[PDB]
Structure 1
Amino acid sequence: DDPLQQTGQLFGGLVRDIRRRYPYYLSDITDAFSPQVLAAVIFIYFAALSPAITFGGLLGEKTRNQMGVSELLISTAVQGILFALLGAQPLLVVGFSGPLLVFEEAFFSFCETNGLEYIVGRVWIGFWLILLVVLVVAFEGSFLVRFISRYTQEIFSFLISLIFIYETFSKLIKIFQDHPLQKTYNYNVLMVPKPQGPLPNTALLSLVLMAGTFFFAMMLRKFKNSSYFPGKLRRVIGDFGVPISILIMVLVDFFIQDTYTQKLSVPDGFKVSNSSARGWVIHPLGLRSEFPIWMMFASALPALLVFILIFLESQITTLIVSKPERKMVKGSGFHLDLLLVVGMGGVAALFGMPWLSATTVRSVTHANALTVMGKAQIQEVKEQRISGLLVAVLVGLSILMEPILSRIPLAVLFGIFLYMGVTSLSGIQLFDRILLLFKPPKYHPDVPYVKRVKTWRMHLFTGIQIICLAVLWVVKSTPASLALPFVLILTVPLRRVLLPLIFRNVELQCLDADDA
């Protein structure tokens, strides 16, 4: 009944993952029949689409359109469908992540200097990824995930929420920089790719649209837990809170005629970003020049970095989502999900498309959206495969449905990202204890780590975790940002060898507890 356990047989953990979950397959279809599930699809679609559009454009720039938006929309769609149908935890949301973009910029630059075909180079990384994951899953290497405690989990989940919130505000500020509040503006600026010079009212409306969307989202959640209107109506308006918030502020922008705001932009059709550079299928041996044999072997080194990047964020995401506290009964599979994510990623390379990963903020948003609230306590979660399938299909079709998307401002979606980031800081005990730094000890809750631990020692423990977050944020800022996963790893030694010198066993049990 314990997922993270070494059996002895090859592919032991994987067979136990399939046998565990696939019996519930029909339930994974019939549980989706609920308007809450539909409200979840609409929400998580916009969560899933905007990153693909944003990161896809950054790949286009950094890579000379050898990979761009089209490639990432297709990858996100196809890998999204396959994972929704075959995966052990369907509530995970596979997609491109900041760390993966950083690597792609890094590997491109290497190939420019050394005179390699970048897109052909990725194919060999992809072959090594397939070889690595089939070895790991064979010898049941996912069992090591059991040594990642709450301590490391909450440092990770908290950092990822802060970064998410930080980047959203960075995007708002960019608008102000591009379109500053001036006395006079040139009034013949071209709009062909984008506004050439600054224009009036764009930055302040963007702020209003953002602040508007966030407010309605937060208010309709407050309303959901209120005692106004009949419960059946109040629950439904609460479920569709985010889609209502979006629809309101999208109509606000629609009626405001003469003021410019940035809209979502998908590619024209389904075709590679640079048609001259590459086709659909990338040749291993080379496109123009012969691919060198040393790099076919040397690609093993980048493959290990990409593996670790995908593994850590994906397996920790799974831990966070599949916690006992959140009422998920169907069962998670670490062995099966690893194989699909990394396996599909290795194959994607061969069609010049990005390998993806189970991303934390989106996956957690998706899981929270399907959670029903009793009395406030968690009653159950709507664990099904339809939400994840429909979002993957919609992201794929997004190119066809440009007429709808071309009327949605980004500023509106920034409000929904602010909502997602804030809402994600919920069951994290780190955040709870950080708040108790500011409350006096009289008005502290009756949770075990308050009663059984002295207030200053509890605070010392919180402070040490805050110092970890600081060190992680500094490494983030420096050029060596691909090290972040390997610095998270060091949080496991800290907890296991260092902290027991300072804190006694009884304190470390209550503070860093498995089930709470």
Structure 2
Amino acid sequence: FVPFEGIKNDLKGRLMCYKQDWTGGFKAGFRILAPTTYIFFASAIPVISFGEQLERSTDGVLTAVQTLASTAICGMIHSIIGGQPLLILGVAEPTVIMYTFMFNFAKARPELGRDLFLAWSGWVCVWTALMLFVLAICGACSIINRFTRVAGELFGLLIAMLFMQQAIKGLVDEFRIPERENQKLKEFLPSWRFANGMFALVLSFGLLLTGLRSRKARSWRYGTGWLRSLIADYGVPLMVLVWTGVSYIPAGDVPKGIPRRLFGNWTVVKEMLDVPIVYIIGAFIPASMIAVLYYFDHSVASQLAQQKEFNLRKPSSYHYDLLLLGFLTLMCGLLGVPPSNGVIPQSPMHTKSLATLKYQLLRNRLVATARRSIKTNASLGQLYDNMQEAYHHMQTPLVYQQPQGLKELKESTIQATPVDETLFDIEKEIDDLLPVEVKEQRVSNLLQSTMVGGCVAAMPILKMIPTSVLWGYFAFMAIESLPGNQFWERILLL
């Protein structure tokens, strides 16, 4: 717990893999788009829903534009000067709840009111940034190492429950009347309300089930490997588009608002000084709560994305990441947008997507080299050396760790068996000698954040997405937040 020690160590560790990170990201060509698109959707949809929630709860002060902008800019800044690019930054539900409480508080104060809510929020963000700077400098993140696996598994289960609760609330609300829209409308009649609710159920459950099924496309006996990979990679986005189109089928015999549809930044410094100095000091309380919440969430999200099973070859940057989070919180507060922070399951999903990308690249290369070696000599022991050489050749030269390497050939495999092609199927065997590795780089995070920012200008296209699709995705991510963790497995076995 020495001042500036952890930050300096993290910077030293991460400064010798920066060019390597960018060059590795550029090494893979357009194949990096699949994880990028997957995480882009996973980050945009919850953020858009949170923006709509804030707009309904803040009388239009904060909308999806502000949340999307915060997520975007903070994501780009982290991707460029972050330290742990595997982390995905975005506006989380606890931030929305806290901002709702602050807005409700300020609305009842004649001193603050509604026109000064953003300024008071900015002062709260300044206090939170100071607290985060103090925590990072003093090495308070060292306690994160103390927290064991269950400390993160419980948080993941809690986030899954929160996402499922949000989805269920949305589905139920599809049956009810909004508190802002015109009450005397054709689309809001009890019969049409029931129809909207059941249609929302159909769309949401269809999206959820089809996406879950498509996630297992690679393990299908039918179609070609190209199509199977395309489905396994872009199924959930494709399902989103497909069910959005399905929602338009009965448009010729139904009122306008059936099913219900969805729908830069500025500075608040000038009006920040107009706040009387009895609430600038009072911001220490909500700032304290938000600082504690962010200290916990950022670190837990970063560590859940750096699981030992992934065999990462680069160090961690907890302290420097917290310092940059303080800086980003200050910037967001000054810009009049809610702060962003490390979110789950977005970060572990990003890590798993990168691991799958590297796995597929390695599988393709090894299958190619095995096929090339089968024709020439194919000695079953000289071919294996060729695949090992190719594996080492693909690898990025670093200084911290070394490649895991192809694992030992199983005794049963050699016993079953130059090499006879009839008795040696490459596709069946390669999967048995492929380690778990992650393609670590900064390109995927940068593109994902830029795409989220681009959604600000694509609002007309986003107007065509029904809310039922959002609730189906929320449940999909909730199930993704318990993808087989040890705690969930033990509860299941109990």
TM category (shorter chain) comes to 0.7 to 0.9
Matching residue of 2:15: 22
Q: What is the one-letter code of the residue matched to 1:354?
A: P
Greater alpha carbon shift after TM alignment, 339-348 vs 313-322: 339-348
8 Å CA contact 1:327, 1:381 repeated in 2: yes
Q: CA deviation at 1:132?
A: 1.8
C-alpha separation in 2, matches of 1:284 and 1:46: 34
Q: CA deviation at 1:171?
A: 1.1
Q: CA deviation at 1:255?
A: 3.6
C-alpha separation in 2, matches of 1:389 and 1:196: 46
C-alpha separation in 1, matches of 2:491 and 2:147: 21
Greater alpha carbon shift after TM alignment, 152-161 vs 26-35: 26-35
Counterpart check, 1:13 vs 2:6:
yes
Q: CA deviation at 1:133?
A: 2.1
The TM-score normalised by the length of structure 2 is: 0.75
Q: CA deviation at 1:190?
A: 5.5
Instruction: Provide Cα deviations, 1:323-351, integer angstroms capped at 9, x if missing partner.
Output: 10123323331012111222211221122
Q: CA deviation at 1:257?
A: 2.5
Instruction: Provide Cα deviations, 1:343-369, integer angstroms capped at 9, x if missing partner.
Output: 211221122211121111222222222
Q: What is the one-letter code of the residue matched to 2:88?
A: V
Counterpart check, 1:189 vs 2:188:
no
8 Å CA contact 2:133, 2:323 repeated in 1: yes
**Helix, strand or coil at the partner of 1:257:** helix
C-alpha separation in 2, matches of 1:36 and 1:239: 10
**Helix, strand or coil at the partner of 2:175:** helix
C-alpha separation in 2, matches of 1:28 and 1:227: 36
Q: CA deviation at 1:150?
A: 1.4
**Helix, strand or coil at the partner of 1:395:** helix
Matching residue of 2:407: none
Q: CA deviation at 1:178?
A: 4.2
8 Å CA contact 1:77, 1:393 repeated in 2: yes
Matching residue of 1:313: 297
Describe how 1:29-178 pairs up with structure 2 within 5 A: 29-32=22-25, 33=28, 37-114=32-109, 115-116=111-112, 117-178=116-177
C-alpha separation in 2, matches of 1:342 and 1:296: 18
Q: Which runs of 4+ in 1 moved over 4 A?
A: 195-198
C-alpha separation in 1, matches of 2:329 and 2:265: 20
Q: What is the one-letter code of the residue matched to 2:236?
A: V
Structure 2: runs of 5+ lacking an equivalent:
179-183, 364-430
Describe how 1:184-223 pairs up with structure 2 within 5 A: 189=185, 199=192, 201-223=195-217
Matching residue of 1:422: 479
Describe how 1:436-515 pairs up with structure 2 within 5 A: 436-437=493-494
Matching residue of 1:261: 259
8 Å CA contact 2:119, 2:269 repeated in 1: no
8 Å CA contact 1:307, 1:342 repeated in 2: no
Matching residue of 1:367: 351
Matching residue of 1:283: 271
Q: Residues 102 and 418 of structure 1: is their aligned pair in 2 closer, same or farther, counting only changes over 3 Å?
A: closer
Matching residue of 1:275: none
Instruction: Provide Cα deviations, 1:347-406, integer angstroms capped at 9, x if missing partner.
Output: 211222111211112222222222215829862222222222122222222132133322
**Helix, strand or coil at the partner of 1:371:** helix
C-alpha separation in 1, matches of 2:317 and 2:265: 35
8 Å CA contact 1:40, 1:369 repeated in 2: yes
8 Å CA contact 1:89, 1:333 repeated in 2: yes
C-alpha separation in 2, matches of 1:145 and 1:414: 33
C-alpha separation in 1, matches of 2:225 and 2:309: 25
Q: CA deviation at 1:35?
A: 5.1
Greater alpha carbon shift after TM alignment, 146-155 vs 225-234: 225-234
**Helix, strand or coil at the partner of 2:437:** strand
Q: What is the one-letter code of the residue matched to 2:354?
A: L
Q: Residues 113 and 417 of structure 1: is their aligned pair in 2 closer, same or farther, counting only changes over 3 Å?
A: closer
Instruction: Provide Cα deviations, 1:17-64, integer angstroms capped at 9, x if missing partner.
Output: 122223222343344425553122222223222333322233233333
Q: Residues 240 and 59 of structure 1: is their aligned pair in 2 closer, same or farther, counting only changes over 3 Å?
A: closer
Q: What is the one-letter code of the residue matched to 1:263?
A: R
Q: Residues 419 and 371 of structure 1: is their aligned pair in 2 closer, same or farther, counting only changes over 3 Å?
A: farther
C-alpha separation in 1, matches of 2:203 and 2:186: 24
8 Å CA contact 1:111, 1:118 repeated in 2: yes
C-alpha separation in 2, matches of 1:99 and 1:378: 37
Instruction: Provide Cα deviations, 1:454-473, integer angstroms capped at 9, x if missing partner.
Output: xxxxxxxxxxxxxxxxxxxx
Describe how 1:373-388 pairs up with structure 2 within 5 A: 375=431, 379-388=436-445
**Helix, strand or coil at the partner of 1:283:** helix
Q: Residues 215 and 298 of structure 1: is their aligned pair in 2 closer, same or farther, counting only changes over 3 Å?
A: closer
Q: Residues 62 and 219 of structure 1: is their aligned pair in 2 closer, same or farther, counting only changes over 3 Å?
A: closer
C-alpha separation in 2, matches of 1:384 and 1:397: 22
Matching residue of 1:431: 488
Q: CA deviation at 1:232?
A: 4.7
**Helix, strand or coil at the partner of 2:436:** strand
Q: Aligned residues, how many? A: 406
C-alpha separation in 2, matches of 1:101 and 1:48: 15
Q: Residues 371 and 227 of structure 1: is their aligned pair in 2 closer, same or farther, counting only changes over 3 Å?
A: farther
Q: What is the one-letter code of the residue matched to 1:16?
A: N
Structure 1: runs of 5+ lacking an equivalent:
1-5, 180-187, 273-278, 438-516
Q: CA deviation at 1:293?
A: 2.7
Q: Residues 425 and 403 of structure 1: is their aligned pair in 2 closer, same or farther, counting only changes over 3 Å?
A: same
Q: Residues 110 and 347 of structure 1: is their aligned pair in 2 closer, same or farther, counting only changes over 3 Å?
A: same
Q: Residues 197 and 15 of structure 1: is their aligned pair in 2 closer, same or farther, counting only changes over 3 Å?
A: farther
8 Å CA contact 1:31, 1:383 repeated in 2: yes
Counterpart check, 1:351 vs 2:329:
no
**Helix, strand or coil at the partner of 1:102:** helix
Q: Residues 370 and 283 of structure 1: is their aligned pair in 2 closer, same or farther, counting only changes over 3 Å?
A: same
Q: CA deviation at 1:87?
A: 1.0
Q: What is the one-letter code of the residue matched to 1:29?
A: W
Which protein shows a greater Rg?
A: 2
Query: How many percent identity over aligned positions?
Result: 28
Instruction: Provide Cα deviations, 1:159-191, integer angstroms capped at 9, x if missing partner.
Output: 111221221122112213349xxxxxxxx9357
C-alpha separation in 2, matches of 1:92 and 1:198: 46
**Helix, strand or coil at the partner of 1:264:** coil
**Helix, strand or coil at the partner of 1:407:** coil
C-alpha separation in 1, matches of 2:242 and 2:58: 38
8 Å CA contact 2:46, 2:474 repeated in 1: no
Q: CA deviation at 1:300?
A: 2.3
C-alpha separation in 1, matches of 2:265 and 2:23: 36
Q: Residues 423 and 110 of structure 1: is their aligned pair in 2 closer, same or farther, counting only changes over 3 Å?
A: closer
